[PDB]
Amino acid sequence: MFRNQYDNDVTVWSPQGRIHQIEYAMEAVKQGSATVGLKSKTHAVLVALKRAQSELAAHQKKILHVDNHIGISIAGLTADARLLCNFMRQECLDSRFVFDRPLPVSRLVSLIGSKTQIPTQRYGRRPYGVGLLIAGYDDMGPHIFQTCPSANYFDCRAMSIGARSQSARTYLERHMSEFMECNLNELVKHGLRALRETLPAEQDLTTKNVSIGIVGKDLEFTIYDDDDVSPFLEGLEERP
Amino acid sequence: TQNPMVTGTSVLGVKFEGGVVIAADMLGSYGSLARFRNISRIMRVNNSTMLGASGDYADFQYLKQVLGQMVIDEELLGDGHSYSPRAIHSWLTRAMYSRRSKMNPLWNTMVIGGYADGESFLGYVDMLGVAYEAPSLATGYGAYLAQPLLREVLEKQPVLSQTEARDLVERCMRVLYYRDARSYNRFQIATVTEKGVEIEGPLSTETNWDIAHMIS
């Protein structure tokens, strides 16, 4: 009908100055469930909402360990997120082996972006159809990074990626003026109220669909699963 | 380096209260010939790390090149992350062990002094990868002739001032001038403190030869 001459491969520029395969991979992340990341002065919390293939299946993981100080959360193709986790875990191991110190989180994120630019420019290979949301703690404090399929990476005060995560960004931009002075529990509840607003009217945050990952100053990266999100969700308020 | 050619002798180092002071004489000998008499065997790595080296000086110039390009490539990012003295020490341990394991050593013996986060760092790395940290270091014949004076002072008084450590380093350099036949009467003293790395030199020793007349 309106068939496009230029959205064939990633090595084709449109005459409008655009690369459509990169743009189309940018909405592979809106094919993923929502994930909020946000940081205080001392902690960085990744809250994600995860879904199940059936009531008997067990809720696909979205927060993944990368190191003791870096933990990411994913939205989009979980096959590309596995390539990215294997890469990032190996870079963390390599610089804890050579320099005996944790990675700067921004250097790993720069290194991810240099990795993912390569299939955006070379033939016969697709861009990574995942966006990551990267919590980390290092010498410069806590960090929240967003990486996108366009190989562009973002240093964030707070961020939401995934499907209908506009509403979380409307929450987060409204409330980012008090994220830095939060303690841990209030920062987690801000992330949950951002995640709770990426829901329809009949849905609620339960212990099965919520996964919370926290890194901090005196805290290594820990993923709080089913029973462990009960202290974090049984302090919220009813849906407004 | 299977065979070192122009070597540098002992490199000292001691932690004081507020930093580390290291020294090295300014001589590179070819065998016994004092051939290269104004060469600096102490590197400034960055603001908070300094590095003096023994052994082959071409290998130390290689490590100056590689480690200085690492410091440049790190400072280009501007991300507020600097290589610590412990990170330079661990990278250099990996480098020396990796060259050891290929049976192609870098014929060096290095003292990495540093001062980051209000904590002093002093680190030994040799050509086999044997690394450790200590309050006083001495390579070459300093491990025989200077490390006794250093460790006896650091036994009586664990926390030295900068003046006491500077005088102790000068005093051990005088001993190494008397008893080490590859040493030389011209040395640099490098200090790292909160103010950064300063390299002072060339400094000389005060010689005493009163025992030369005690022979009859």
From Swiss-Prot, chain A:
Subcellular location, principal: cytoplasm
Induction: Induced in breast cancer tissue (at protein level). Up-regulated in liver tumor tissues.
Keyword Ubl conjugation: yes
Gene giving rise to this polypeptide: PSMA1
Self-association state and partner proteins as the record states: The 26S proteasome consists of a 20S proteasome core and two 19S regulatory subunits. The 20S proteasome core is a barrel-shaped complex made of 28 subunits that are arranged in four stacked rings. The two outer rings are each formed by seven alpha subunits, and the two inner rings are formed by seven beta subunits. The proteolytic activity is exerted by three beta-subunits PSMB5, PSMB6 and PSMB7. Interacts with NOTCH3. Interacts with ZFAND1.
CC terms in the record's Gene Ontology section: centrosome; cytoplasm; cytosol; extracellular exosome; nucleoplasm; nucleus; proteasome complex; proteasome core complex
Glycyl lysine isopeptide (Lys-Gly) (interchain with G-Cter in ubiquitin) cross-link site: 115, 208
Location relative to the cell: Cytoplasm; Nucleus
A Pfam family: Proteasome
Keywords: Acetylation, Cytoplasm, Glycoprotein, Immunity, Isopeptide bond, Nucleus, Phosphoprotein, Proteasome, Ubl conjugation
Lineage: Eukaryota, Metazoa, Chordata, Craniata, Vertebrata
Positions in coiled-coil regions: none
Protein source organism: Homo sapiens (Human)
Residues that bear N-acetylmethionine: 1
Modified residues (Phosphoserine): 110, 177
Protein name: Proteasome subunit alpha type-1
Annotated family: Belongs to the peptidase T1A family.
InterPro entries for the chain: Ntn_hydrolases_N (IPR029055), Proteasome_alpha (IPR050115), Proteasome_alpha-type (IPR023332), Proteasome_alpha1 (IPR035144), Proteasome_asu_N (IPR000426), Proteasome_sua/b (IPR001353)
GO biological process, one term: proteasome-mediated ubiquitin-dependent protein catabolic process
Keyword check for Cytoplasm: yes
Swiss-Prot record, chain B:
Location(s), subcellular: Cytoplasm; Nucleus
Segments forming a coiled coil: none
Keyword Protease: no
GO MF terms, alphabetically ordered: lipopolysaccharide binding
One GO term describing the cellular component: mitochondrion
Keyword Hydrolase: no
Modified residues (Phosphotyrosine): 57
Predominant cellular place of this UniProt entry's protein: cytoplasm
Alphabetically ordered keywords of this record: Acetylation, Cytoplasm, Disease variant, Host-virus interaction, Nucleus, Phosphoprotein, Proteasome
Induction cue: Up-regulated in fibrolamellar carcinomas.
GO biological process, one term: proteasome-mediated ubiquitin-dependent protein catabolic process
Its biological purpose: Non-catalytic component of the 20S core proteasome complex involved in the proteolytic degradation of most intracellular proteins. This complex plays numerous essential roles within the cell by associating with different regulatory particles. Associated with two 19S regulatory particles, forms the 26S proteasome and thus participates in the ATP-dependent degradation of ubiquitinated proteins.
Family under the similarity heading: Belongs to the peptidase T1B family.
Quaternary structure (record): The 26S proteasome consists of a 20S proteasome core and two 19S regulatory subunits. The 20S proteasome core is a barrel-shaped complex made of 28 subunits that are arranged in four stacked rings. The two outer rings are each formed by seven alpha subunits, and the two inner rings are formed by seven beta subunits. The proteolytic activity is exerted by three beta-subunits PSMB5, PSMB6 and PSMB7. Forms a ternary complex with SMAD1 and OAZ1 before PSMB4 is incorporated into the 20S proteasome. Interacts with PRPF19. (Microbial infection) Interacts with HTLV-1 Tax protein.
Disease in which the protein is involved: Proteasome-associated autoinflammatory syndrome 3: An autoinflammatory disorder characterized by onset in early infancy and recurrent fever, nodular dermatitis, myositis, panniculitis-induced lipodystrophy, lymphadenopathy, and immune dysregulation. Variable accompanying features may include joint contractures, hepatosplenomegaly, anemia, thrombocytopenia, recurrent infections, autoantibodies, and hypergammaglobulinemia. Some patients may have intracranial calcifications. PRAAS3 inheritance is autosomal recessive or digenic.
Name of the protein: Proteasome subunit beta type-4
UniProt source species: Homo sapiens (Human)
Source organism phylogeny: Eukaryota, Metazoa, Chordata, Craniata, Vertebrata
Encoding gene, per UniProt annotation: PSMB4
Whole-protein residues included: 46 to 261 of 264
